[PDB]
Enzyme design. Structure first.
Site, short mmCIF file in Angstrom:
data_model
loop_
_atom_site.label_atom_id
_atom_site.label_comp_id
_atom_site.label_asym_id
_atom_site.label_seq_id
_atom_site.Cartn_x
_atom_site.Cartn_y
_atom_site.Cartn_z
N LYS A 171 0.86 -1.17 0.00
CA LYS A 171 0.00 0.00 0.00
C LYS A 171 0.90 1.23 0.00
O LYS A 171 1.64 1.45 0.97
CB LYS A 171 -0.84 0.06 1.28
CG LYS A 171 -1.88 1.19 1.29
CD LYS A 171 -2.31 1.53 2.71
CE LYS A 171 -1.26 2.38 3.43
NZ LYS A 171 -1.50 3.85 3.21
N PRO A 172 0.88 2.02 -1.09
CA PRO A 172 1.68 3.24 -1.09
C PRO A 172 0.96 4.29 -0.26
O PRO A 172 -0.18 4.05 0.18
CB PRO A 172 1.69 3.65 -2.56
CG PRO A 172 0.43 3.06 -3.11
CD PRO A 172 0.31 1.75 -2.42
N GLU A 174 -1.32 7.43 0.58
CA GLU A 174 -2.48 7.97 -0.13
C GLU A 174 -2.12 9.27 -0.85
O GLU A 174 -2.71 9.60 -1.88
CB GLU A 174 -3.73 8.16 0.78
CG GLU A 174 -3.65 9.16 1.93
CD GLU A 174 -2.84 8.71 3.14
OE1 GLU A 174 -2.91 9.42 4.17
OE2 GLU A 174 -2.16 7.66 3.10
N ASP A 208 -4.85 -0.07 8.28
CA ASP A 208 -5.18 -0.80 9.50
C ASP A 208 -5.80 -2.17 9.24
O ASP A 208 -5.55 -3.11 10.00
CB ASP A 208 -6.05 0.04 10.45
CG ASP A 208 -5.28 1.22 11.05
OD1 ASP A 208 -4.05 1.32 10.85
OD2 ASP A 208 -5.92 2.04 11.74
N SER A 224 6.84 8.13 9.77
CA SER A 224 7.24 8.92 10.92
C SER A 224 7.13 8.07 12.19
O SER A 224 6.60 6.96 12.15
CB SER A 224 6.39 10.19 11.03
OG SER A 224 5.01 9.88 11.16
N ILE A 225 7.66 8.60 13.31
CA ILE A 225 7.61 7.91 14.61
C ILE A 225 6.16 7.74 15.07
O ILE A 225 5.83 6.76 15.75
CB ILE A 225 8.48 8.64 15.68
CG1 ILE A 225 9.96 8.63 15.27
CG2 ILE A 225 8.32 8.00 17.07
CD1 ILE A 225 10.89 9.32 16.23
N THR A 227 3.22 7.37 13.03
CA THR A 227 2.54 6.28 12.29
C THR A 227 3.16 4.91 12.58
O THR A 227 2.52 3.88 12.39
CB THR A 227 2.46 6.54 10.76
OG1 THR A 227 3.78 6.74 10.23
CG2 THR A 227 1.59 7.77 10.45
N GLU A 245 11.39 1.66 9.65
CA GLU A 245 12.21 2.74 9.11
C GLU A 245 11.43 3.99 9.52
O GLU A 245 10.45 4.36 8.88
CB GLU A 245 12.37 2.63 7.59
CG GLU A 245 13.07 3.82 6.94
CD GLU A 245 14.54 4.01 7.32
OE1 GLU A 245 15.14 3.13 7.98
OE2 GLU A 245 15.10 5.04 6.93
N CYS A 279 15.07 11.00 5.35
CA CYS A 279 15.53 10.50 6.65
C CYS A 279 17.04 10.68 6.88
O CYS A 279 17.51 10.76 8.02
CB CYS A 279 15.17 9.02 6.77
SG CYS A 279 13.40 8.63 6.62
N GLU A 377 12.81 15.93 14.58
CA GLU A 377 12.98 15.90 13.13
C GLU A 377 12.02 16.91 12.51
O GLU A 377 10.87 17.00 12.92
CB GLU A 377 12.69 14.49 12.59
CG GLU A 377 12.96 14.29 11.11
CD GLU A 377 12.63 12.89 10.61
OE1 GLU A 377 11.76 12.21 11.21
OE2 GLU A 377 13.24 12.46 9.60
#
Lengths: 473, 473, 473, 473
Positions: A171-172, A174, A208, A224-225, A227, A245, A279, A377
């Site tokens: 899933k890329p 959205e 989900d 991100s931290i 998600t 990652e 990153c 970040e």
């Protein structure tokens, strides 16, 4: 309208329509229908069924699929470049010259790597028993791609997973689904039906359902931290294995000893490439007192000369941020920094007027270790400079971070270069350069930056299962 | 009165007193004071500080500490054996002959393994840049040991962690802390202050404070699926890396082709060793129709002859269950099985009258794939037998399990042996044997049995961080 | 009288008596009887018979023998030190502090390495066939040890060979047999009869019978290019596999950029350690024009201060040469150099008057690339200095050598250090140091310096046979 | 007329004209001029010069050349097949279906393998020093290809050598040079001038000049024990490193337990494939007493049905022998066997009347272990059968051989299969099959069959140099 790839067939999403924007113009490019909860299930079922056959294929057979896929992408290089540029705001010339060839190389690398897996010597570790070690595929893998490098991260997740013999449901983001859905059309016939599945939708509706599915054995994420925390606590009861990652705040340590012009040119490129939405971006600079002032001036001149403009125009060096929401986060992070009395804005500072989600290349000096601009970040075209004195000091500061993905040391002393690179707590350390990645070498974080690696043989090993078989004579 | 090991010093727990039982007599052996939340913090701080120095030690230096620790255990073999036997109910002769030497071997193995870590060839993967790969320690590691093999699992967690160059804070099960606290006394001076920390307490008071601590970089656990789910969702926001060992329901697949007497003898030992309180216990048998009836009779005779008695008595083959709480879970699981009309109790069946937590070696025949006795782990001296017909059938059944730790196939056909072992979804597959483990070979689960491995070079790699260093010419 | 170890029994040599000298006094220490041609045969037969059982032992069993052997040596450290010092002329304090611990470490390293052999992942590389890779022992191994480091080279040959599961027949140099024959007494009962065989004699009478024996599968040698050529053409018709270590002329490349005092101190130690009788000795220096003159003066002061004296006296830094014959070769090589008009003798020059085989630490400056003193190995306490200008130039000179064992580069530039170490044609390259060896890292030559490696996992792999086993389903 | 490839240019040989025969018709195909001693020197000089640049290329760059070369061969598959068939007598359909795809796969495999080389973890093995391990190219490599599989063996020697970064000078057999010289035309522009050099001529005029050249660092050979002994004693004074493949006498061990029809079909194919002119040919059969007579009859029927004929005709299963000289050696070896009173000729026996060098598929039964037909390699379409009783017996016989390349065990017992494969002294052991090779798995002999391996990562490692770089902090 772009379609979804489920069990070797292209279908329209049964879910709600979602609009995809062009970050350079702020306009809507297209509207794509999301995958319905039933389709996400259908995709996982397709992968689960396909695994019985696909997991038994030889590494040679898999290598051939990946090489064939790489050719398809290379032949369609220009088309992918235009889509990626249109959907992300990335300057077109950078996509054609840097990204596409890198993507092609990733597939070719894994095609070769698939046939070179390590094991331990088979033998009699226990009298009268032959032990051997095999590396088998995990099963069904769910991959969630981020919005910064849509097609490249898709490659980083598909290549090793497929090479290892797994079935994937990807899933890329959205925000950026165009390249992934384009790839789905080309890869449709390259792999057996169900081996490769491409879905589309928001993390709340599609993501989900996918990550929480009982038949998904592994979930590999890049984001991100925030998600990342959400998915790790969502898959916790199922005891699924993960591959994380989760960004980073790459430190750039500069000693008196360093070539200041080379640092300035490096930060000009690597701290603002892809609008700093990377990153590994050289965004956190520690300059030694001796060369501090001189470097700040050189950076000021280097950063302010970055030309912002249309992505399809050859001269454009800096593109816009990915979305309106991200433009707001970056603006907020920079405003908190400006609020601090000691922070000096050398160049840039705020968002630029116009249709797109452009933000001026910002350089913030005199930042202190405790400041939010140095700890959190920003993931935008923002760079901070902090002064330091000794190695011990800068080493403690660099290591006193929640992040641990990449870093660089700029110095001419052989002793110092090796002494620091051995002690830095970052998955990667460059010396007198930064941001350089190669398919053969691993890329992955430490601490809150995640675990598991992208690229290299280590990247492939994360998608395999070490198994011990012991036969009694 | 046993003490805790914090920063190279032995101290009394400031927490609440907890009673430790002797499962063979049902009596309380001692009362030990738990670690207070402040002491758990003190232990983590001690490890964090010690890491700066310890993480830079040479593999040689670490190997020497492990070899020295192994000697200490071997010289105190008899004392550890008595404690382990007294606290777990394990027959004394088994501890002296099987466990202690295995523990000693684990340390010696890792001492050697510490100096043999794999990397990729250093070289120029990018023109004018030398890349190299190093494996550095993770940092502070929190280890939670289970109650079935207190000292052995402690070894499985300490050896690789320390060999890799990490600092450890280990908490044994509140049920079985004696051997771990004894080890703390011996290892006190072997490692620098703070490198090794031994705490004590319940998972609610001490365990949660330890695993949730911000400075703990990795958490390695061995327990049930329940306590594993709890820790994985507790450490999820911190994005900590985990190492999970969460039990299993090891299938024993027997074909007409098999040596029935060898199977019977194997199940007699491996299905009831340590009172069946083992993740690899041969507890789920699939017997092919042709030999089904004959095997059921042979197992009946083999199981019923197991001598239950005092752990210190040489003739004792089967000990009691670990605790009153576990005796209740096993009893409940067996009662649900007896309630099913089709289940035949061949031998044993219920808990035996007496002071200890003894449960009779039980053999349940005619069990069906869907039955709870075949799906859920009992972790007691209980074995079930299910009939099957073809390979495809038994393979689907074996793989349609939440567990994936160990398994065995009993057959004389070379083709069949390899064909099944290649397709089983278990971290381990024995052929014509079961339960055999060696320090050189990996031991770890798949699916809900966890991820990450104990023993072997792979076990050591889980406690290291692959790092890419690139120097520009 | 020292005895031979044949088939687990200590026996007197049936061959001719050979006198063993004390190089420091020129006097005869003892007289030992050589192995007769029949005893050499008996030793090989013993090894051949012992192999059936020994080759099937587990890596664990072998590791335990090596660890036990290491303990025996460590407990007898002082005795070995006195023998090695008495027989070789090595200053006693160096043997006690450097050599013995190194020897002990080598055995311990291989004990661990024996259980960590690499293989490829077992699996289905061809549909319906399981392939696996095992590393089995070669068989009977004949080891010939040199005279410079008698006990250490014995360790370098015994450790990997035994760890791999081979049976060994080792012959130390006739010049230095004391330590090897002492080891034979201690190792007698550690290994099964025939697994370890220690013989004694000259290369003409014993060596040739051993290396030419039909049952010897592999021959590992360490010596000069002369004795190496002899054995390689002697074993050629049998198509035996060899392991060659044939000296070297290690270049020391010094740039303007280097720390001259550190170079001077390094050459003072590493160019004259063990009287320069070492394959890795820093004997060939290339100094860049800018620092040439300054370095020559510093070396002059450093070399001339070396204190020559009695080996048992703590203050002694330089010992004598191994034998009268070698003293003559060194003298001749130095005289040819002095004969050249352009050569400047900075210090030393000729042999010193006295009973022992002492030769003054010599430093020859203004040597040119084509000179014999720079091309041929002297293997004595002699160092030459040559001026150079650019990297390209010095790199061509360093690589235009028949030798390829070790080398060092002294510079502070990170770029230069890596650029040269990547391009040097030497099995080993040190940066800002020299002569440092560790058990984990490989030591072996290139070109005429030989092939195959001592120490590390690579050292163990040379004594194994990769085998591919493929089972059809 | 076919030309030579020297320094990226195609040139005519200055040496004497040599005639190339068509083994199926006995007629001369063409006449090619050999390389003159000056041209052999020119080729080596070209490689030596090209190495400076080629040795520094990235594994990625090399992988791209190999992939490009593989494509060229695949696109010209049919042409290579016709040449190979015309020059060797190999049935055309076998070359198109088996050989060409295998060759193509070998290049693709090494293209991938080039980027996956193993090393040891970089780190501090000695306090304050960073050690790393790199695998650098050897330099100029001389490859001598045999006549049995001209193009395939060329691939086996070129692929790893080039992938490792070496420069090659290859000489195919004078008997079969067509495919190699054809490859030279295609590969001409794929690699930089001098990287790949293809010469032509007899082992006496060209081969000896090439292997004895001072600038050749390594010599890899495939041939008979005779031509191997000649080269190993010729390169002995230069201390060059070698890679030997010197034939074998592959044993086929059949137990009562085996599937006789599967053995018969296997021996029918693998014992006579390529006219038995293969090092792995199933030519030496040990049949257990119980099934001896039955197997002899089945083999008789299977072997006698082999259709001999024109190589271009689809129905042809067996081709002729490579040359008139080899036809004479095979005839002599078979005549010595027939002379023995106990030998029974089941089928075939002597050479067939006709133009080509055809020899009838021969099956010799009742052969005894000591017989020359069982000990010496025939390398023709000849198979011998020997009866045996126990495992110990057949194992001793199989291992009491000068050869050690390949072997197979036919049995249904899992225990027996692993017990024997662990103890056989052959680089390869197949179970219930034979002759199956894959690019990922190593192929190489033991004892007089040679050392060093073809294919797999091990094949690539033989063309690299392990180097230890140590930087002092």
């Amino acid at each position: 309208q772009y379609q979804l790839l489920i069990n070797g067939v292209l279908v329209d999403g049964e879910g709600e329509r979602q609009s995809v924007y062009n970050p350079a113009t702020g306009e809507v490019i297209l509207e794509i229908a999301e995958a319905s909860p039933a389709q996400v299930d259908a995709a996982v079922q397709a992968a689960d069924n396909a695994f019985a056959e696909w997991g038994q294929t030889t590494p040679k057979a898999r290598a051939e699929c990946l090489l064939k896929l790489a050719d398809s992408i290379e032949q369609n290089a220009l088309e992918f470049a235009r889509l990626e540029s249109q959907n992300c705001g990335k300057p077109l010339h950078c996509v054609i010259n840097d990204e596409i060839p890198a993507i092609v190389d990733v597939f070719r690398f894994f095609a070769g790597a698939a046939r070179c897996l390590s094991g331990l010597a088979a033998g009699e570790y226990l009298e009268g028993h032959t032990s051997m070690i095999r590396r088998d595929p995990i099963g069904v893998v769910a991959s969630i791609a981020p919005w910064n490098y849509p097609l490249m991260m898709a490659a980083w997740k598909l290549a090793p997973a497929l090479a290892a013999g797994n079935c994937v449901v990807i899933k890329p983001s959205e925000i950026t689904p165009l390249t992934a859905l384009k790839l789905a059309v080309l890869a449709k016939d390259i792999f057996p039906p169900g081996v490769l599945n491409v879905l589309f939708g928001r993390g709340q509706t599609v993501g989900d359902v996918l990550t929480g599915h009982e038949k998904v054995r592994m979930v590999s994420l890049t984001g991100s931290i925030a998600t990342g925390e959400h998915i790790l606590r969502h898959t916790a009861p199922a005891i699924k294995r993960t591959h994380m990652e989760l960004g980073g705040k790459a430190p750039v340590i500069v000693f008196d000893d360093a070539d200041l012009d080379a640092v300035a040119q490096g930060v000009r490129t690597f701290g603002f490439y892809n609008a700093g939405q990377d990153c590994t971006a050289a965004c956190r600079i520690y300059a030694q007192r001796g060369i501090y002032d001189a470097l700040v001036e050189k950076l000021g001149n280097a950063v302010s000369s970055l030309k912002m403009g249309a992505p399809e125009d050859e001269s454009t060096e800096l593109g816009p941020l990915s979305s309106l929401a991200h433009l707001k986060r970056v603006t907020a992070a920079v405003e908190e920094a400006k609020a601090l009395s000691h922070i000096r804005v050398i160049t840039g500072g705020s968002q630029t007027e116009g249709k797109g989600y452009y933000f001026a290349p910002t350089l913030l000096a005199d930042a202190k270790q405790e400041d939010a601009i140095v700890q959190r970040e920003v993931f935008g075209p923002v760079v901070s400079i902090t002064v330091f004195d000794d190695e011990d000091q800068v080493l403690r500061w660099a290591n006193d971070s929640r992040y641990g993905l990449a870093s660089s040391v700029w110095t001419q002393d052989v002793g110092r270069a090796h002494r620091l690179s051995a002690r830095l707590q970052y998955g990667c350390t460059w010396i007198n350069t930064h941001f350089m990645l190669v398919s053969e070498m691993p890329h992955g974080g430490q601490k809150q930056s995640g675990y598991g690696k992208d690229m290299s043989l280590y990247g492939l090993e994360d998608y395999t299962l070490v198994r011990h078989i012991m036969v009694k004579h």
